[PDB]
């Protein structure tokens, strides 16, 4: 029963129009719980899960103050980075940041992260030691030198090991009815003739949480990946997830195939046969 807290942010410059657009979201495991959008009318960090709404006005005032400062700093950094690369003002560019912490079942810090990207490729990241940085290019080495002089790593580490794991523990307590649940997948199989010779067997997993799941196809009890197809796990829109796996089989041999579904919410793995 490990858990994570993660904050994502995306800043895109809009050279035709006015200021950059900044969107931040926060997540606990696979559940989003806050958002901020610099274009939105409210100008507040906003709740996106029920169990965060019990936080009072000091919390929402604090998160709004801090995320607005993150937004403004990204604005500055888009200009700074464009100058580092000698890039044209006519082009739109993107800064993305992800940071957060993992904890185990006992609430103890497992590891912490902070990764930065520019135009969708690594720019700079805090290393596994929580002490040093990896810069992806010459421009990021300018940033690395600045963050070394400023001792950013030490201030960030204190958040990751402290503040981050404390609030995560509090959120996991306040949202335990939904955060510490497992919804097992609802499973079924469909069958879709392709020709007289062939048919598709599709194995469905619906309404599960968390998103982690394994769907396997077998023929006569032997694992089968030939003629398989796995779709990306996708949100249902209600906080649960969906996935399917298919296999193309000779007509009349459907009975030989079995689908196997493993998920945290299932006591025993499920086996399906057409």
């Amino acid at each position: 029963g490990s858990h994570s807290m993660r904050y994502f942010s995306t800043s895109v410059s809009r050279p035709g129009s006015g200021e950059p657009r900044f969107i931040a979201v926060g997540y606990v495991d696979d559940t989003q719980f806050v958002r901020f959008d610099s274009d939105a009318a409210s100008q507040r960090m906003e709740p996106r899960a029920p169990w965060i709404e019990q936080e009072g006005p000091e919390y929402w005032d604090q998160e709004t103050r801090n995320v607005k400062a993150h937004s403004q700093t990204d604005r500055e950094n888009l200009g700074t980075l464009r100058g580092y690369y000698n890039q044209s003002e006519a082009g739109s560019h993107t800064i993305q940041i992800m940071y957060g912490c993992d904890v185990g079942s006992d609430g103890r810090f497992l590891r912490g992260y902070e990764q930065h990207a520019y135009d969708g490729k690594d720019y700079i990241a805090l290393n596994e030691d929580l002490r040093s940085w990896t810069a992806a290019d010459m421009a990021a080495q300018i940033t690395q030198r600045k963050w070394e002089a400023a001792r950013r790593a030490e201030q960030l580490r204190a958040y990751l090991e402290g503040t981050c794991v404390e609030w995560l523990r509090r959120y996991l307590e306040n949202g335990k009815e939904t955060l510490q649940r497992t919804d097992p997948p609802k499973t079924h199989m469909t069958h879709h003739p392709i020709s007289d010779h062939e048919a598709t067997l599709r194995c469905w997993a619906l309404g599960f949480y968390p998103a982690e799941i394994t769907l396997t196809w077998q023929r006569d009890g032997e694992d089968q990946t030939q003629d398989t197809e796995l779709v990306e796990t996708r949100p249902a829109g209600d906080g649960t997830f969906q996935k399917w796996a298919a296999v193309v089989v000779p007509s009349g041999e459907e009975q030989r195939y079995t689908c196997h579904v493993q998920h945290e919410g299932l006591p025993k793995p499920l086996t399906l046969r057409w």
């Binding site: 926060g26 801090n66 400062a69 940041i97 400023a150 503040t163």
Partner: peptide
């Protein structure tokens, strides 16, 4: 809760 400081690059 978010980290309080983001730094210029």
């Amino acid at each position: 809760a978010i980290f309080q400081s983001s730094m210029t690059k």
